[PDB]
Design an enzyme around this catalytic site. Structure first.
Site, short mmCIF file in Angstrom:
data_model
loop_
_atom_site.label_atom_id
_atom_site.label_comp_id
_atom_site.label_asym_id
_atom_site.label_seq_id
_atom_site.Cartn_x
_atom_site.Cartn_y
_atom_site.Cartn_z
N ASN A 179 -28.84 44.24 18.75
CA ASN A 179 -29.34 44.38 17.39
C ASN A 179 -29.78 43.04 16.79
OD1 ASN A 179 -29.60 45.81 14.65
ND2 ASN A 179 -28.10 44.21 14.18
N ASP A 222 -35.25 29.44 5.79
CA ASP A 222 -35.58 28.25 5.00
C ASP A 222 -34.82 27.01 5.48
OD1 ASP A 222 -37.43 29.46 3.27
OD2 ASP A 222 -35.86 30.10 1.88
N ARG A 224 -20.92 49.44 26.14
CA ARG A 224 -20.54 49.73 24.77
C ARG A 224 -21.61 49.09 23.88
NH1 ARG A 224 -17.16 46.25 22.94
NH2 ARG A 224 -16.52 46.10 20.75
N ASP A 242 -23.23 48.02 20.62
CA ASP A 242 -22.75 47.58 19.31
C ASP A 242 -23.73 47.88 18.18
OD1 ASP A 242 -21.03 45.87 17.53
OD2 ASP A 242 -22.84 44.63 17.50
N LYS A 298 -25.89 52.11 14.56
CA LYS A 298 -26.39 52.71 13.33
C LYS A 298 -27.41 51.75 12.69
CE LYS A 298 -25.09 54.71 8.84
NZ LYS A 298 -24.07 54.83 7.75
N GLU A 353 -21.21 51.95 18.87
CA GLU A 353 -20.30 51.73 17.76
C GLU A 353 -21.00 52.08 16.45
OE1 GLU A 353 -19.07 49.12 14.31
OE2 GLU A 353 -20.86 48.97 15.57
N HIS A 405 -11.11 46.10 17.03
CA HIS A 405 -11.25 44.70 16.64
C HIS A 405 -11.76 44.46 15.21
CE1 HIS A 405 -15.17 45.96 17.98
NE2 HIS A 405 -15.71 44.90 17.40
N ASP A 406 -12.07 45.53 14.49
CA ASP A 406 -12.54 45.37 13.12
C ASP A 406 -11.53 45.79 12.06
OD1 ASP A 406 -15.01 44.21 13.74
OD2 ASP A 406 -15.97 46.17 14.01
O1 LIG Z 1 -35.81 34.20 0.68
C1 LIG Z 1 -34.43 34.14 0.35
C2 LIG Z 1 -33.60 33.83 1.58
O2 LIG Z 1 -33.81 34.92 2.51
C3 LIG Z 1 -33.09 34.80 3.74
O3 LIG Z 1 -31.70 34.84 3.55
C4 LIG Z 1 -31.15 36.17 3.55
C5 LIG Z 1 -30.59 36.48 4.93
O4 LIG Z 1 -31.63 36.42 5.89
C6 LIG Z 1 -29.96 37.88 4.93
O5 LIG Z 1 -29.35 38.13 6.19
C7 LIG Z 1 -28.90 37.98 3.82
O6 LIG Z 1 -27.76 37.24 4.16
C8 LIG Z 1 -26.63 37.39 3.28
C9 LIG Z 1 -25.87 38.69 3.61
O7 LIG Z 1 -26.71 39.81 3.37
C10 LIG Z 1 -24.61 38.79 2.75
O8 LIG Z 1 -23.86 39.93 3.15
C11 LIG Z 1 -23.75 37.53 2.91
O9 LIG Z 1 -23.21 37.50 4.20
C12 LIG Z 1 -21.89 36.92 4.27
C13 LIG Z 1 -20.84 38.03 4.22
O10 LIG Z 1 -20.97 38.76 3.00
C14 LIG Z 1 -19.45 37.42 4.32
O11 LIG Z 1 -18.47 38.46 4.35
C15 LIG Z 1 -19.34 36.59 5.60
O12 LIG Z 1 -19.36 37.43 6.72
C16 LIG Z 1 -18.26 37.26 7.63
C17 LIG Z 1 -17.58 38.61 7.88
O13 LIG Z 1 -17.03 39.11 6.68
C18 LIG Z 1 -16.48 38.44 8.93
O14 LIG Z 1 -15.89 39.71 9.22
C19 LIG Z 1 -17.09 37.86 10.21
O15 LIG Z 1 -17.99 38.78 10.75
C20 LIG Z 1 -18.37 38.62 12.12
C21 LIG Z 1 -17.31 39.30 13.02
O16 LIG Z 1 -16.11 38.54 13.00
C22 LIG Z 1 -17.80 39.47 14.46
O17 LIG Z 1 -16.87 40.26 15.18
C23 LIG Z 1 -19.16 40.16 14.46
O18 LIG Z 1 -19.01 41.44 13.92
C24 LIG Z 1 -19.43 42.53 14.76
C25 LIG Z 1 -18.33 43.60 14.75
O19 LIG Z 1 -17.13 43.09 15.30
C26 LIG Z 1 -18.82 44.80 15.55
O20 LIG Z 1 -17.82 45.81 15.61
C27 LIG Z 1 -20.06 45.32 14.82
O21 LIG Z 1 -20.52 46.48 15.43
O22 LIG Z 1 -21.10 44.34 14.90
C28 LIG Z 1 -20.76 43.11 14.21
C29 LIG Z 1 -21.92 42.15 14.42
O23 LIG Z 1 -22.10 41.87 15.80
O24 LIG Z 1 -20.08 39.37 13.72
C30 LIG Z 1 -19.75 39.27 12.31
C31 LIG Z 1 -20.87 38.52 11.63
O25 LIG Z 1 -21.00 37.20 12.14
O26 LIG Z 1 -17.71 36.60 9.93
C32 LIG Z 1 -18.78 36.66 8.95
C33 LIG Z 1 -19.28 35.24 8.76
O27 LIG Z 1 -18.34 34.46 8.04
O28 LIG Z 1 -20.38 35.60 5.65
C34 LIG Z 1 -21.72 36.14 5.57
C35 LIG Z 1 -22.69 34.97 5.69
O29 LIG Z 1 -22.68 34.16 4.52
O30 LIG Z 1 -24.52 36.37 2.61
C36 LIG Z 1 -25.69 36.19 3.44
C37 LIG Z 1 -26.33 34.88 3.04
O31 LIG Z 1 -26.96 34.99 1.77
O32 LIG Z 1 -29.45 37.60 2.55
C38 LIG Z 1 -30.03 36.28 2.51
C39 LIG Z 1 -30.53 36.05 1.09
O33 LIG Z 1 -31.30 37.16 0.63
C40 LIG Z 1 -33.48 33.51 4.46
O34 LIG Z 1 -32.72 33.38 5.66
C41 LIG Z 1 -33.22 32.31 3.55
O35 LIG Z 1 -33.64 31.11 4.19
C42 LIG Z 1 -33.99 32.49 2.23
O36 LIG Z 1 -33.69 31.42 1.32
CA CA Z 2 -31.40 46.09 13.07
#
Ligand SMILES: OC[C@H]1O[C@H](O[C@H]2[C@H](O)[C@@H](O)[C@@H](O[C@H]3[C@H](O)[C@@H](O)[C@@H](O[C@H]4[C@H](O)[C@@H](O)[C@@H](O[C@H]5[C@H](O)[C@@H](O)[C@@H](O[C@H]6[C@H](O)[C@@H](O)[C@@H](O[C@H]7[C@H](O)[C@@H](O)[C@H](O)O[C@@H]7CO)O[C@@H]6CO)O[C@@H]5CO)O[C@@H]4CO)O[C@@H]3CO)O[C@@H]2CO)[C@H](O)[C@@H](O)[C@@H]1O
Ligand code: CA
Ligand SMILES: OC[C@H]1O[C@H](O[C@H]2[C@H](O)[C@@H](O)[C@@H](O[C@H]3[C@H](O)[C@@H](O)[C@@H](O[C@H]4[C@H](O)[C@@H](O)[C@H](O)O[C@@H]4CO)O[C@@H]3CO)O[C@@H]2CO)[C@H](O)[C@@H](O)[C@@H]1O
Ligand SMILES: OC[C@H]1O[C@H](O[C@H]2[C@H](O)[C@@H](O)[C@@H](O[C@H]3[C@H](O)[C@@H](O)[C@@H](O[C@H]4[C@H](O)[C@@H](O)[C@H](O)O[C@@H]4CO)O[C@@H]3CO)O[C@@H]2CO)[C@H](O)[C@@H](O)[C@@H]1O
Ligand SMILES: OC[C@H]1O[C@H](O[C@H]2[C@H](O)[C@@H](O)[C@@H](O)O[C@@H]2CO)[C@H](O)[C@@H](O)[C@@H]1O
Ligand code: CA
Ligand code: CA
EC number: 2.4.1.19
Length: 686
Positions: free
Chosen positions: A139, A147, A227, A229, A232, A257, A327-328
């Site tokens: 995915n 940016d 599996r 990932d 959906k 998943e 794991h989640d």
């Molecule tokens: O033009 C403006 C602007 O646009 C662009 O920026 C945008 C981004 O492109 C866009 O993606 C969006 O990003 C924002 C998110 O939408 C927003 O939710 C937020 O993200 C946060 C999040 O909210 C936080 O909770 C935190 O996330 C954590 C998780 O909570 C943790 O659980 C962990 O996770 C990771 C897991 O540990 C891993 O196991 C795995 O997960 C997998 C599962 O295990 C599996 O079962 C499942 O099926 O699949 C999963 C995925 O494989 O990965 C998980 C993810 O890594 O860790 C994360 C990370 O700490 O942090 C995130 C990140 O901050 O904030 C995002 C940033 O804003 O919106 C942006 C703005 O609109 C351009 O890129 C930019 O340049 C421009 O300026």
């Molecule tokens: Ca997608």
């Protein structure tokens, strides 16, 4: 080979999976451990690498920890190379220890091991009759910011070392640039990023061909299952074409998943499992089990309802992968909870329909909140816990008793706290009694089963306070007391005289592909296999024995067929329905229709001249189509798996319930590409 053989890559129903979070299981090779700020050998910081690797898994396979438990399959963290970045998320360092931040799907994550190590893992596992499933997450790549290209690795994607592109300056459109999803709608969650993960654009031919070539590399390495990932969050049509690529090459058990919350029953979820070419992790099962055995938010009536409903909603309920945690979510066993709750949930899962998957460490009574607290290093490899013994006693039953692996499920006794259910397949029977009330026993009178007259010992040997069962004529059991927290398993096995199909896999492929039909009573001499009314016998039946048949799909028109077999004497078996014969190799094509106005509730669908498009039957039309992210209403779009190189006629429909309004004029026409993707853009014809 028998249906229970480790070589059976198409059927995991007789197996018990152990969910291995690689970095947290066993560090068998300290030499490949990441260094510096990306590593914590004590595994105190659960967001850094702890050292768990494939050599460790090999060691635990060889020293008997898994085999002693009756585990016959494992799944591991995505094996592909991940980014090496140490990302700081608000003062906290994070690494790709979890394996979900891919950068090269054609290389291994060096922390887990090399290609040679992976080959060694496959070999060690197979030598101990353990199948190997790999997580695969096509995915996205990794965390990125368009940016800020200096952030992490800018979600860069490599093809065996060669850079294809990154999230910044993505002129090739290898990724989606529609912001992040808010999970408001299915479409929103598919075409927008998960978190900050660079969303791959499967409509891009390079991405499409690349990922399909990548999975084939792993298939060539000998994996036994996949599996998928975040299913959906990827186009369902593209995923179907992906499963077609897999099945039309080397079919292996695949499931995705798709998270479901408490009390969530999703028709989309059911349809995906029924028509995508892969099954799913059974969240409906898991969530209900937690409500009933862990959180006390529903009783046995709710458990029964889930069992009956799911058996009717999923075309192949026996392919859904069950679990009580992963794991989640928070680990099932709470620190201050009675361990019997976990032990019962395990016994229930191990003897229920589907494919059981135990999260690593469950048997050691590990407790932990949500990610990453549920990912602690396994604290012990003791075979002495009650939980370990429960698995050890029941896991093997999925192999020895086909009622557990392929049987129907019927409630035989029930009240708020007690559920006694029966599994039955051919002459084989298993009866399971569970009393979740840890304080009050129950008087079981009036229990009737399919068990032959006789005395049955609890397979758990009283480990969970079970008792012996006395069955008289008519399958009526003598009155007995089901102890508080009591859990007992009674079973009976015997030869089945009539050919009986318990499983078929894969359930979607083109003619010429070999499918595996498992069950009992097939006889030793080649019989006949039926695809609808079409009979197949002789040479195309590659092999035939009592529990397993290998047969090539006949060259019949694409469509949905009932599978049935007859022994050499001509006695016909039960019917295993919903087999999809594809019209040929598949390619993912995006259909776009312009100016298709609708009323609220009314949606646009796609219909056409091939089975992949429902052969003009509105009831089988593709959709509902999308109209918010990639294209906006009144324009609609959808990604569809269609036969490669075929000239196809099609039209769009507007449906309100089952009421249909057709495009006027002549059919639209196009020829699907021989490989890669394509986009067909047309105007709605009044
Ligand atoms: O033009 C403006 C602007 O646009 C662009 O920026 C945008 C981004 O492109 C866009 O993606 C969006 O990003 C924002 C998110 O939408 C927003 O939710 C937020 O993200 C946060 C999040 O909210 C936080 O909770 C935190 O996330 C954590 C998780 O909570 C943790 O659980 C962990 O996770 C990771 C897991 O540990 C891993 O196991 C795995 O997960 C997998 C599962 O295990 C599996 O079962 C499942 O099926 O699949 C999963 C995925 O494989 O990965 C998980 C993810 O890594 O860790 C994360 C990370 O700490 O942090 C995130 C990140 O901050 O904030 C995002 C940033 O804003 O919106 C942006 C703005 O609109 C351009 O890129 C930019 O340049 C421009 O300026
Ligand atoms: Ca997608
Ligand atoms: O999951 C989110 C929702 O998905 C589904 O909604 C879809 C509609 O069922 C489908 O008809 C279409 O909606 C379009 C309308 O058909 C079209 O008329 C117009 O809607 C107007 C509306 O007529 C007018 O009264 C109102 O004032 O303004 C609307 C414009 O925003 O455009 C609609 C598309 O934006 O597509 C929908 C999916 O995008 C489910 O049916 C719904 O229950 C879910 O909430
Ligand atoms: O399966 C045998 C036939 O298959 C194919 O026929 C399919 C058409 O190619 C396909 O277009 C569609 O037909 C629908 C029309 O497109 C749609 O306009 C409408 O037709 C109405 C028409 O609008 C109206 O003016 C008239 O009074 O009634 C028509 C309905 O009878 O609905 C059509 C579907 O009912 O689906 C067809 C399959 O059902 C082959 O092309 C054909 O040669 C085969 O005989
Ligand atoms: O005896 C046949 C009967 O057995 C079960 O009924 C139980 C019931 O579930 C208990 O709650 C309690 O009322 O005792 C009954 C037996 O006397 C089955 O549930 C029922 O369908 C079946 O007919
Ligand atoms: Ca290591
Ligand atoms: Ca079925």
């Amino acid at each position: 080979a028998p249906d229970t053989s480790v070589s059976n890559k198409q059927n995991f129903s007789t197996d018990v999976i152990y969910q291995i979070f690689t970095d947290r299981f066993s560090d068998g090779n300290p030499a490949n451990n990441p260094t510096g700020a990306a590593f914590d050998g004590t595994c105190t910081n659960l967001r850094l690498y702890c050292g768990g690797d494939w050599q460790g898994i090999i060691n635990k396979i060889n020293d008997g920890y898994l085999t002693g438990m009756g585990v016959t399959a494992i799944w591991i963290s995505q094996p592909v190379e991940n980014i090496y970045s140490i990302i700081n998320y608000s003062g906290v360092n994070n690494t790709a220890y979890h394996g979900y931040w891919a950068r090269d799907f054609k290389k291994t994550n060096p922390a887990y091991g090399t290609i040679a190590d992976f080959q060694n893992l496959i070999a060690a596992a197979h030598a101990k009759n353990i199948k190997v499933i790999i997580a695969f997450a096509p995915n996205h790549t990794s965390p990125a910011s368009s940016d800020q290209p200096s952030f992490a690795e800018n979600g860069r994607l490599y093809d065996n070392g060669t850079l294809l592109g990154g999230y910044t300056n993505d002129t090739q459109n290898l990724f989606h640039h529609n912001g992040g999803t808010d999970f408001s709608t299915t479409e929103n969650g598919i075409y927008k990023n998960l978190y900050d993960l660079a969303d791959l654009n499967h409509n891009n031919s390079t991405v499409d061909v690349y990922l399909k070539d990548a999975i084939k590399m792993w298939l060539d390495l000998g994996i036994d299952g996949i599996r998928m990932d975040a299913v959906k969050h990827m186009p369902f049509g593209w995923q179907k074409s992906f499963m077609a690529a897999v099945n039309n090459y080397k079919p292996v058990f695949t499931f995705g998943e798709w998270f479901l919350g408490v009390n969530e029953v999703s028709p989309e979820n059911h349809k995906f499992a029924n028509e995508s070419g892969m099954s799913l992790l059974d969240f409906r099962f898991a969530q209900k089990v937690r409500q009933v055995f862990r959180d006390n938010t529903d009783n046995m009536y709710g458990l029964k309802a889930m069992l009956e409903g799911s058996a009717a909603d999923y075309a192949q309920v026996d392919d859904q992968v069950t679990f009580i945690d992963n794991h989640d979510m928070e680990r099932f066993h709470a620190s201050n909870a009675n361990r019997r709750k976990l032990e019962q949930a395990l016994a229930f899962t191990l003897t229920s329909r589907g494919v059981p998957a135990i999260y690593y460490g469950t048997e050691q009574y590990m407790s932990g909140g949500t990610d990453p607290d549920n990912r602690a290093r396994i604290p012990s490899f003791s075979t002495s816990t009650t939980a370990y013994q429960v698995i050890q006693k029941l896991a093997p039953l999925r192999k020895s008793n086909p009622a557990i692996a392929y049987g129907s499920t019927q409630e035989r006794w029930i009240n708020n706290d007690v559920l006694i259910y029966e599994r039955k397949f051919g002459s084989n029977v298993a009866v399971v009694a569970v009393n979740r009330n840890l304080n009050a026993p129950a008087s079981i009178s009036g229990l009737v089963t399919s068990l032959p007259q006789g005395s049955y010992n609890d397979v758990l040997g009283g480990l969970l306070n079970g008792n012996t069962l006395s069955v008289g004529s008519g399958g009526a059991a003598s009155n007995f007391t089901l102890a508080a927290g009591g859990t007992a398993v009674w079973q009976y096995t015997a030869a089945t005289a009539t050919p009986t199909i318990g499983h078929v896999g894969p359930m979607m492929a083109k003619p010429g592909v070999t499918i595996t039909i498992d069950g009992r009573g097939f006889g030793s001499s080649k019989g006949t296999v039926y695809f609808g009314t079409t009979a197949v016998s002789g040479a195309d039946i590659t092999s035939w024995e009592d529990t397993q048949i290998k047969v090539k799909i006949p060259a019949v028109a694409g469509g949905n067929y009932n599978i049935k077999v007859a022994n050499a004497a001509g006695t016909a078996s039960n019917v295993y329905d919903n087999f999809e014969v594809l019209s040929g190799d598949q390619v993912s094509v995006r259909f776009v229709v312009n100016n298709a106005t609708t009323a609220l509730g009314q949606n646009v669908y796609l219909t056409g001249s091939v089975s992949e498009l429902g052969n003009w039957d509105p009831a089988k039309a593709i959709g509902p189509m999308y109209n918010q992210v990639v294209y906006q209403y009144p324009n609609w779009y959808y990604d569809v798996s269609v036969p490669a190189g075929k000239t196809i006629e099609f039209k769009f429909l507007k449906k309100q319930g089952s009421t249909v309004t057709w495009e006027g004029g002549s059919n639209h026409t196009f020829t699907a590409p021989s490989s890669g993707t394509a986009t067909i853009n047309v105007n709605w014809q009044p």
